[PDB]
């Protein structure tokens, strides 16, 4: 049974699931548009979106908290300087998911994840 439970296993251990979403969020902040499998994109918004919320208030304790959850110095600086000021007046919903077909190799459903207000 699974009643009222959140979270996908994705056929990994809990430690390897955590490392993978840590990597995915770092890539998303750096490139602002990435392509991945649809189930992975839906579990990613429960990790990346709370990090953008935390960067709205800039302080030493917040930046350390962001670094503990993204062990990346470039990601901590992209937050707190660009993301967090761009979404200061945005009440959630910072990333958007769009289905984009299937892979040729294994017929896996794919999706686009991008930030809502990319400068371009």
């Amino acid at each position: 049974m699974r009643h009222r439970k959140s979270g996908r296993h994705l056929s990994r251990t809990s430690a390897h699931r955590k490392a993978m979403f840590q990597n995915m969020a770092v890539s998303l902040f750096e490139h602002e548009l990435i392509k991945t499998t649809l189930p992975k994109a839906k579990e990613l918004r429960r990790v990346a979106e709370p990090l953008i919320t935390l960067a709205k208030e800039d302080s030493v304790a917040n930046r350390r908290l962001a670094f503990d959850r993204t062990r990346s110095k470039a990601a901590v600086g992209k937050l707190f300087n660009d993301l967090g000021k761009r979404y200061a007046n945005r009440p959630g919903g910072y990333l958007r998911i769009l289905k984009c077909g299937f892979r040729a190799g294994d017929n896996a459903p794919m999706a686009y994840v991008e930030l809502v207000d990319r400068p371009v």
Partner: protein, 55 residues
């Protein structure tokens, strides 16, 4: 465990009466007339009258 008699031609064709394939939901973009999967970005990179990825 294995069969004691071989299946007839008719018997195995009845098992395959559920093997048929269904079709997909296709839509046409009003701006360009291009066919795409319903609720999916088109192969040219459009969705709901907007350019999303531009290849």
């Amino acid at each position: 465990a294995v069969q004691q008699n071989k299946k007839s031609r008719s018997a195995r064709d009845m098992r395959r009466s559920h093997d048929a394939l269904e079709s997909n939901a296709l839509s046409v973009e009003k701006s360009t007339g291009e066919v795409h999967l319903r609720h999916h970005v088109s192969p040219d990179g459009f969705y709901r009258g907007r350019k999303v990825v531009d290849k």
